[PDB]
Design an enzyme around this catalytic site. Sequence first.
Site, PDB file in Angstrom:
ATOM      1  N   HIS A  25      -1.033  -8.436   3.669  1.00 36.34           N
ATOM      2  CA  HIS A  25      -1.734  -7.184   3.420  1.00 36.34           C
ATOM      3  C   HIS A  25      -3.246  -7.392   3.309  1.00 36.34           C
ATOM      4  O   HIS A  25      -3.884  -6.969   2.345  1.00 36.34           O
ATOM      5  CB  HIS A  25      -1.192  -6.496   2.175  1.00 36.34           C
ATOM      6  CG  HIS A  25      -1.631  -5.076   2.053  1.00 36.34           C
ATOM      7  ND1 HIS A  25      -1.296  -4.117   2.983  1.00 36.34           N
ATOM      8  CD2 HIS A  25      -2.412  -4.458   1.138  1.00 36.34           C
ATOM      9  CE1 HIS A  25      -1.833  -2.963   2.634  1.00 36.34           C
ATOM     10  NE2 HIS A  25      -2.517  -3.143   1.518  1.00 36.34           N
ATOM     11  N   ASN A  68      -3.295  -3.045  -1.491  1.00 35.60           N
ATOM     12  CA  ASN A  68      -4.678  -3.090  -1.946  1.00 35.60           C
ATOM     13  C   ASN A  68      -5.038  -1.905  -2.828  1.00 35.60           C
ATOM     14  O   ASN A  68      -5.855  -2.044  -3.743  1.00 35.60           O
ATOM     15  CB  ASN A  68      -5.621  -3.152  -0.746  1.00 35.60           C
ATOM     16  CG  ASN A  68      -5.346  -2.059   0.266  1.00 35.60           C
ATOM     17  OD1 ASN A  68      -4.215  -1.881   0.714  1.00 35.60           O
ATOM     18  ND2 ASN A  68      -6.381  -1.314   0.624  1.00 35.60           N
ATOM     19  N   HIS A  69      -4.458  -0.738  -2.565  1.00 34.11           N
ATOM     20  CA  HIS A  69      -4.765   0.425  -3.384  1.00 34.11           C
ATOM     21  C   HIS A  69      -3.972   0.444  -4.683  1.00 34.11           C
ATOM     22  O   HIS A  69      -4.461   0.973  -5.686  1.00 34.11           O
ATOM     23  CB  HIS A  69      -4.511   1.700  -2.593  1.00 34.11           C
ATOM     24  CG  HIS A  69      -5.448   1.891  -1.443  1.00 34.11           C
ATOM     25  ND1 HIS A  69      -5.181   1.415  -0.178  1.00 34.11           N
ATOM     26  CD2 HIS A  69      -6.654   2.501  -1.369  1.00 34.11           C
ATOM     27  CE1 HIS A  69      -6.178   1.733   0.628  1.00 34.11           C
ATOM     28  NE2 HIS A  69      -7.086   2.387  -0.071  1.00 34.11           N
ATOM     29  N   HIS A  81      -2.680  -2.912   5.606  1.00 29.44           N
ATOM     30  CA  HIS A  81      -4.093  -2.671   5.314  1.00 29.44           C
ATOM     31  C   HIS A  81      -4.852  -2.042   6.478  1.00 29.44           C
ATOM     32  O   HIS A  81      -6.025  -1.688   6.334  1.00 29.44           O
ATOM     33  CB  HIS A  81      -4.782  -3.967   4.887  1.00 29.44           C
ATOM     34  CG  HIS A  81      -6.100  -3.754   4.219  1.00 29.44           C
ATOM     35  ND1 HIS A  81      -6.442  -2.565   3.614  1.00 29.44           N
ATOM     36  CD2 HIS A  81      -7.165  -4.575   4.066  1.00 29.44           C
ATOM     37  CE1 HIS A  81      -7.660  -2.663   3.114  1.00 29.44           C
ATOM     38  NE2 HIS A  81      -8.121  -3.873   3.375  1.00 29.44           N
ATOM     39  N   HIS A 108      -4.891   1.098   9.315  1.00 27.40           N
ATOM     40  CA  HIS A 108      -4.352   2.418   9.603  1.00 27.40           C
ATOM     41  C   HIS A 108      -4.142   2.664  11.086  1.00 27.40           C
ATOM     42  O   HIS A 108      -3.858   3.799  11.476  1.00 27.40           O
ATOM     43  CB  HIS A 108      -5.265   3.495   9.031  1.00 27.40           C
ATOM     44  CG  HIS A 108      -5.071   3.729   7.570  1.00 27.40           C
ATOM     45  ND1 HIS A 108      -5.939   3.245   6.618  1.00 27.40           N
ATOM     46  CD2 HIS A 108      -4.099   4.387   6.896  1.00 27.40           C
ATOM     47  CE1 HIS A 108      -5.516   3.603   5.419  1.00 27.40           C
ATOM     48  NE2 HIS A 108      -4.402   4.297   5.561  1.00 27.40           N
ATOM     49  N   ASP A 121       0.814  -1.209   0.000  1.00 27.51           N
ATOM     50  CA  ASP A 121       0.000   0.000   0.000  1.00 27.51           C
ATOM     51  C   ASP A 121       0.848   1.259   0.000  1.00 27.51           C
ATOM     52  O   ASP A 121       0.371   2.326   0.392  1.00 27.51           O
ATOM     53  CB  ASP A 121      -0.976   0.019   1.177  1.00 27.51           C
ATOM     54  CG  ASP A 121      -2.275   0.715   0.839  1.00 27.51           C
ATOM     55  OD1 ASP A 121      -2.427   1.121  -0.330  1.00 27.51           O
ATOM     56  OD2 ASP A 121      -3.137   0.862   1.735  1.00 27.51           O
TER      57      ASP A 121
HETATM   58 MN   LIG Z   1      -3.875  -1.833   2.868  1.00 27.83          MN
HETATM   59 MN   LIG Z   2      -3.158   1.691   3.749  1.00 30.35          MN
END
Ligand SMILES: [Mn+2]
Ligand SMILES: [Mn+2]
EC number: 3.1.-.-
Lengths: 334, 408, 411, 412
Positions: free
Chosen positions: C212, C123-124, C240, C242, C55
């Site tokens: 992740h 993931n992004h 993943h 925050h 990420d």
């Molecule tokens: Mn992530």
């Molecule tokens: Mn993130």
Amino acid sequence: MSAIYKLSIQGIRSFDSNDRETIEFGKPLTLIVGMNSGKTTIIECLKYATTGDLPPNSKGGVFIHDPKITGEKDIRAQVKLAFTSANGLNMIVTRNIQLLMKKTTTTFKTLEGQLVAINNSGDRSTLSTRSLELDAQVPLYLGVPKAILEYVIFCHQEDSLWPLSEPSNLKKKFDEIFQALKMQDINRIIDELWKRTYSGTDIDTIKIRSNYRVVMYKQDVELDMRGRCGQKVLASIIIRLALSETFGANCGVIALDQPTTNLDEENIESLAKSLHNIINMRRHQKNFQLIVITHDEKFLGHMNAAAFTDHFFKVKRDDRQKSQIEWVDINRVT
Amino acid sequence: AIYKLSIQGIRSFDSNDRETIEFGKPLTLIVGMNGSGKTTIIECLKYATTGDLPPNSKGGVFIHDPKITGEKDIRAQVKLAFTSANGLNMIVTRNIQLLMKKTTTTFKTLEGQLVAINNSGDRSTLSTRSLELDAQVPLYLGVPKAILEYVIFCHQEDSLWPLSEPSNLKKKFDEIFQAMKFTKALDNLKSIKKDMSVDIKLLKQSVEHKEWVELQTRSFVTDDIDVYSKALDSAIMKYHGLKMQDINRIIDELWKRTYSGTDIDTIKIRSDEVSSTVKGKSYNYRVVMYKQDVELDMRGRCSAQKVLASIIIRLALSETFGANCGVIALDQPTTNLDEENIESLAKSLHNIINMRRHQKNFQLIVITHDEKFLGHMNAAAFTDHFFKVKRDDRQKSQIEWVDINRVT
Amino acid sequence: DYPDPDTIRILITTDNHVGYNENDPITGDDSWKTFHEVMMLAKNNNVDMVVQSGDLFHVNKPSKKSLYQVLKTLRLCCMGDKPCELELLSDPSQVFHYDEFTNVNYEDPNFNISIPVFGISGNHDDASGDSLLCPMDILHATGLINHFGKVIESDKIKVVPLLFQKGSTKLALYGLAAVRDERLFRTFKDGGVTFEVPTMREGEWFNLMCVHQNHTGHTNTAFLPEQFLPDFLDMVIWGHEHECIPNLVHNPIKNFDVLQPGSSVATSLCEAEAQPKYVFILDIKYGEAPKMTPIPLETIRTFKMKSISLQDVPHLRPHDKDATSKYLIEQVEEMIRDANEETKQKLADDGEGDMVAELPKPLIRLRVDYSAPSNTQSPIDYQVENPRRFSNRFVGRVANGNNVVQFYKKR
Amino acid sequence: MDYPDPDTIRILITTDNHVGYNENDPITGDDSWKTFHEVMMLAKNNNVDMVVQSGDLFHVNKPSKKSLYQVLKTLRLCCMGDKPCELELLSDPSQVFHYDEFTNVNYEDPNFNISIPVFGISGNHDDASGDSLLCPMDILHATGLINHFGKVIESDKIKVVPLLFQKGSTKLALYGLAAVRDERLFRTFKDGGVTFEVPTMREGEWFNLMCVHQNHTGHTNTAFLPEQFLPDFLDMVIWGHEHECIPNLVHNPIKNFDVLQPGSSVATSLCEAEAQPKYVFILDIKYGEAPKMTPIPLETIRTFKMKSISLQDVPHLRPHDKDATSKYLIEQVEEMIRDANEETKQKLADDGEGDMVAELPKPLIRLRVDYSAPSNTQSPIDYQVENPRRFSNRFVGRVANGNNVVQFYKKR
Ligand SMILES: [Mn+2]
Ligand SMILES: [Mn+2]
Ligand SMILES: Nc1ncnc2c1ncn2[C@@H]1O[C@H](COP(=O)(O)OP(=O)(O)OP(=O)(O)O)[C@@H](O)[C@H]1O
Ligand SMILES: Nc1ncnc2c1ncn2[C@@H]1O[C@H](COP(=O)(O)OP(=O)(O)OP(=O)(O)O)[C@@H](O)[C@H]1O
Ligand SMILES: [Mn+2]
Ligand SMILES: [Mn+2]
């Protein structure tokens, strides 16, 4: 055509009734950006004082900033529109429209305007003040027909998809452009963009055959899309971008209030190719200013915004719910 | 719930072959290109449940047009698979035909075969009447016939009622049922009291002279129902005083997390019961902007804060009013929306499906091709595939199974 | 000080999210500036290697400013003349099996790379496009990053570990890219995953993993259970999420620690970002326990939160706009004062306060529920304001001046 | 070729690589990066001392992910050997590379074993755009596999600064101006807002070299860079932004230099000026005589053909015809496909292999149909055509560009 220098959106929509804030234009393009704040009603203020075109579904002067939001009992708007003309005979004409209230009512009326004719040195000259004569004369020296600036050049943000409704309204609407066998070239310019922009492997070329409608051409037979039609909005764009090109030419050229509705990548990247070709072919013509109101990044980043202008007239909103137009240069858009 | 569909001629699709689309839970997205027919799936999903021609389909042409094929007699078959709220898998096959003459056609609809398939597959035709399935399948699904044709599946050509015409049209939605549905019980209960209210006369005459032993046996039954008329009328006032007032408890809650935060101060629907002297108890709807402490007329005073909330109205009402089958055809939400009314719309749209997972099901068919929103809704957590409709060499639109792994 | 001749050092990061809030004027450069600060902290800490749990970039297709900031950051901190002591045991053609870049860049005869940075995808910024390409794959072509742990088929997952040797220690770096959570769940259901283990010198090895996916997901079958990972692991780094927790998560039956190193930028204003954000340093030694020395991040705008109930406090009559705005304001403009005081202390307590030094504006979130009163069914709720009139009226005083206060109702 | 003579400096001229053009075409979606790798491979084994290019490396100012992967992949393992670059750098390059602490050329870094440099300027296709005023070439310089010069900071204030390299007794002066919009350059040239700083040592010895990236002939009034405006002391110029490739050099009788137009690599617009063969050039420069050129061709450009034919050219075309016009154009494309395929067969046969009947890459084909009735007749109708995408949807499996084989334009 002849350019428009300025308007004056004083106390209308989301701009405050205190300070006069107008934005200026560019050539051969007038790009507008921002969040959905002023922009869509910036198009509303050009015909507003030209012909007295209040928005449909509006009788109580809704367009003026409401006094209750501010908090007083006397709020109004003015539009004086310091702009150019055909032989450079610039003019100013204000529409004295008010939201003044009676005991508990919201009575609506007008006052006298002006018909000054700006001198190149400064010694102006007025003609006559009547608002009926105002709407008779401002189109006369403005050019474009009295039924085209409202629907074709400066259309609404959701009156845009107008041609795909029904035969009768359009059929009686086209009389005003004819001001009453002359329809032979409007469908001529209705399909080259369709070939170029509209990457559709189904239909060849639309027409406007008499029931004025949206006839597709499916293998040389007319598969009508009036009721069996993204193709709607795209055909609408092209119908505007032929009528603006054929009949009348003395004010603006084209104002696409968010043309890029419901169109995907293989269409969105190919969308503005016909716009660029129209600019380049029509840049031989002495005037052109393509007014686009858009927040589509994959549409802006295709037509090379950094290749025709040094600015996009951005619209934002301040603390007191008043929209304030700023001046940000061309590069600063991401 | 909804399970499967098979269009065999309606719209761009051809009559000579059927194409099946297998809906899944909780969302099935149908992307495409402008002319492929991505909204035709939903426009026919609201035919095969309700039996109504979708809006502005007149002149008979809903079917694959003959002159793009050549066949003199063209015919279609719409076949919806749905698990009824009762629990009967009712494969509602419908038939549509168009008999084109030399010059003028005669659009004639044929019967289907409404059959409740059980867990032994006994194909029993529940009903066959052509003009009766339209009024019958809504009963099996569990929702009225006006929530389906206006909310459950709505067509883009007429997808702007909510933030648009009020009294003249918005009410038209609400007044065709409920007000005319619970008054059926009310008018029935009015007479059920009346046959019992004149019953006390039969008792009171007997004492003026069998008639003395059966004399005061229902003297309190005379007013056993007299008390119960407002036990139904306050089963109406308490009904639309909580059901309706839980749609304005969502519309506010829905809006307060969409427009980068929110948009025009507050907005609700004006529930002021204008009791006119034609019907006694009544209603009159209106939607207004509550900029700083008093209302203001929203019509002709707004901007696509319009569309953004039309959905917020349509998405709201059919989550308490019609919430036995969670089916909504929220198609093409992203149209004239800026940058964060597309980011936090999907954050809200994610939240809508993030809490309707405790229910029986939620069905959502997002029909859009704006890659901003296609990444915004994050189909990389909820569904393993996406459907694309596309034409072909002979302009016959098919349905794909293009996996999410391809999506950027 | 230099790690002792048998000591590896590895800076663990995650979710650095370069490319987040690119256009906000007051806060548009926090993400890449924080990435720059952590990489500078890598250069002047003598870290052998930099690992990443995905990420790293906030979008799938990054921005030019994000890319240039990351590359310019890596060239200043990874390129050097110190001989990287990592001896490589594996054949990196099996691991970087995407193309011909089959050797790590610190092994390149034309790059004298001092510190390598290797990371799994996220993931992004997942493998996306007609070629199944990642931004970390672009940073692999530059010869600065080692994109590892790519996954090519969702049904059979083969993980190939890089194996570095140093002195008397070994490393194993199993990657795990971003695959949709049920897909990895289904693949874990039927044993569709195989974990290569080197077959020589049992017990000599340290097995590191980077994963992740969600740890405890709100959905039913959309979270990776910690038990599913095998018993031979010695550690793992969870992206993943925050939320940053400086401590570890020791399991007693699976015998492997976890870490949740959080993020660098504060992505979504919620309770998860109201915690101290660190970045972590691991010194891996064979025969002795690992040590962890987390270091704070010092370029992050101040963020504290408060979630209070509106209808709980008396005098709240739910039909006035001039009786509840004051009550909300006296909380928001109190948290702002506290935030600016904390920013002042942190910025100017280090012997740099002869004059009143400049402050960074803070991030302030207040969560209040405007739901109906609990007893009644009134048709009108509280008339509460919006960002256009409760966060736009705070220009020049707060750094999150569009979402300062939160307006939901608890269903 | 062999190694150049120890006082011969060899440079290679590329331009307008445009990597990532048509990245979504299934067939013509790997033309650009393959051609670029071919140019770099023609650089490595040709024993060239440095590479220059006149911009437009990436197609759009935000190039895609595959484009960056391709360019980094090509530059990384084919430019960097243990051979030293014998061009000694004697200037202080801290001025030309002023955008960060990277204040020196790539091969002079203690962290690069780069055996062949490549100086490139910015292009109007990959100009600075966004929020931080940033170019993709500024991203590539951050990797260090390219070197970036010519960047403008003020449009009105222009200060071009040469770079100076040394080998043997050959002095190389390298002046570079990036791509900015032509109207601002004409304004900056009207008032003489530019500075051309000239070295003050040993005049009459340096090779003065320029790399412009501007239009050659403007259809408008005054929107191009004219030739007579560059200074007198120049010796050669490289003229980007014109994609047409020409092998010779046009000589100026007054300006003390010749012009060069290296062209492009890929075929972005299937136009008439795109049908000329692609070359990458070689310049062997050496004090004491006129430097020579050895233009070498490219074997990794897909075959192209073009024919802008109106329907007024061939007879026997009625205005109402729809099948007849389509059939005539069908057989014309048939002929062009035959010609392109046979010349492709000979091109592949003259590489060293002639027996492997494996495949034959599809030829890009372009047709331009001006369907306009002759102006003498007064018939309202035109020469009707088919749908351009589906007119050419029957060529799929024989033509590289499946959809846009034809474009049905108009011209009076
Ligand atoms: Mn992530
Ligand atoms: Mn993130
Ligand atoms: N009755 C019909 N018979 C034949 N072809 C039809 C008929 N109705 C529509 N079509 C064709 O099919 C397409 C219409 O598909 P549809 O109604 O789903 O629109 P669309 O392009 O998907 O819209 P949007 O992008 O706005 O959702 C058009 O190409 C149209 O010419
Ligand atoms: N009486 C009023 N006084 C001031 N502002 C008002 C009033 N009524 C509405 N507005 C504001 O004007 C907005 C509509 O402006 P406008 O139609 O220009 O929108 P827009 O930003 O262009 O969006 P779109 O693209 O959806 O049309 C409303 O959402 C509201 O914020
Ligand atoms: Mn070029
Ligand atoms: Mn160029």
